[PDB]
């Protein structure tokens, strides 16, 4: 269910 | 395999501004999912997508029609609506180059030929 | 108003094409969060986008640009797909709904 | 971020 690139 | 008036543009004109768009980097190849650490990603996305692939694919008339190439930018940017977290930067960056890439396929020559 | 041909194309081709759609059912009214038990919806999705508001706005004249009511199209889509889970039906829903809007708007008219 | 919690799934 994603795990994602980084987040801001 | 074809050359048409529509898939010159969209290598020309809109695969070009794109690909030097700054938030571009990220999406010139395909995902890494070893370098970047994500040992999910290939069990989430079924159909990676990147320019590098789309941009090839343009200049080896892999094309028929430039809907089908339409259909390419298109899961790449879902693929990282999908995968990514909501709040991930890379959504934004995905979302703004979308809408470019809506913008110029908007002036898209009409007469579908060649 | 006079229409351009492509805000016609948007409600006479793409617009026809999806409301009548078997997938667009989820699509026709903004999500009613609290009828579906979607506390956090609002939290994730800032600008809520659905069909019933883009084919008003084309009934309407609301729209100067073909490219705003495309916008628009690909907001509802791309809601669906950062809100909800990868293996969730609607997001195979919204993905079918969307590659018919691009195949429409690949015969889009040229504005002007 | 992440993935709400949906709508339901298959």
Redesign the interface.
């Given at each position: 269910?994603?795990?994602?690139?980084?987040?801001? | 395999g074809r050359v048409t008036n529509?898939l010159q543009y969209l290598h020309k004109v809109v695969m070009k501004a794109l690909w030097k768009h700054q938030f571009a980097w990220?999406f010139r190849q395909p995902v890494d999912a070893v370098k970047?650490g994500?040992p999910?990603?290939h069990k989430?996305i079924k159909q990676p997508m990147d320019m590098g692939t789309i941009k090839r694919r343009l200049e080896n008339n892999y094309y028929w029609?430039?809907?089908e190439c339409?259909?390419d930018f298109?899961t790449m940017f879902?693929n990282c609506?999908?995968?990514?977290?909501?709040?991930?930067?890379?959504?934004l960056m995905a979302?703004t180059l979308?809408?470019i890439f809506?913008?110029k396929?908007?002036?898209?020559?009409?007469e579908?030929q060649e």
């Open positions: 269910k994603g795990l994602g690139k980084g987040g801001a | 529509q990220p970047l994500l999910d990603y989430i029609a430039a809907s339409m259909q298109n879902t609506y999908i995968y990514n977290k909501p709040t991930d930067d890379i959504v979302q979308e809408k809506l913008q396929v908007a002036s898209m020559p009409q579908e």
